[PDB]
C-alpha cells in the first residue's frame with residue numbers, strides 16, 4: 276500500500292466540501308454518474324477504431340448498488356477505467372486548475388451544486404461519504420484500489436478482490452446520518468431528477 280499527499284488545492288477543496296453547510300447533498304449522485312458516463316463515452320469512442328478494446332467486456336452500463344449492512348452505495352460502470360498514472364498523478368493535475376476556478380466561483384457567489392462545471396464533481400462524494408474507495412481496471416494496466424478518508428492523503432494499492440474485466444467501481448462508505456441514499460425510493464427519485472437522460476442503462480439494484 277502506497278500513501279500519497281493530495282495536491283494542496285485538492286485537500287483545500289475536500290475540506291470545503293466536508294465543512295461547508297450545504298443541504299443539497301443529493302447532487303453527489305449526478306456527479307458520479309456523469310463521471311461514469313464520460314468513461315463509457317471514452318471506451319465507446321476508442322472501440323470504434325480498435326474493436327479489440329471491448330474484449331474485456333462489450334456491455335456499456337452503470338449499476339447502482341446499495342448495501343445497508345455495509346452502509347455503502349456503490350456506483351459501478353464498464354467504462355474505460357483508470358491507469359495507475361491516472362489515479363496518482365494525471366487526474367489530480369487536471370483537478371488542480373478546476374479546483375482553483377471552482378473555489379473562486381464559490382467566493383463570487385456560485386454554489387456547491389455547480390462543482391461539475393469545473394471537472395471536479397468526483398469530490399462531491401465527500402458530501403455523503405466518510406470514506407471513498409475507487410476500484411478500477413483499464414485495458415493494459417492492472418486492477419487498482421484508490422482510497423481516501425480525506426485528511427490530506429490517499430492510498431493506492433494493487434487490488435486482489437474480484438477481477439472486474441474493465442471499468443470502475445466507486446464505493447461510498449456513507450456517513451452515519453446519510454443512510455437515506457441506501458433507500459430504493461430515494462435513489463430512484465435522484466436518478467429521475469438529475470440523471471434522466473444518461474445514454475447508458477442505469478440499473479438500480481435492490482436489497
Ligand SMILES: Cc1c2c(n3c1CCCN(C)C(=O)[C@H](C)Nc1cc-3ccc1C(N)=O)CC(C)(C)CC2=O
Pocket residue numbers: 309310311313314317352354355356357361362363366367369370394395397409421442443
Ligand atoms: C478529476 C477526477 C478524479 C477522479 N475522476 C475524475 C474525473 C476525470 C474524468 N474522467 C471521468 C476520467 O478521467 C476517467 C475516464 N474516469 C473517472 C474519473 C474519475 C472518477 C471516476 C471515473 C470513472 N467512473 O470512470 C477519481 C480520482 C480518484 C482519480 C480523483 C480525481 O481527481
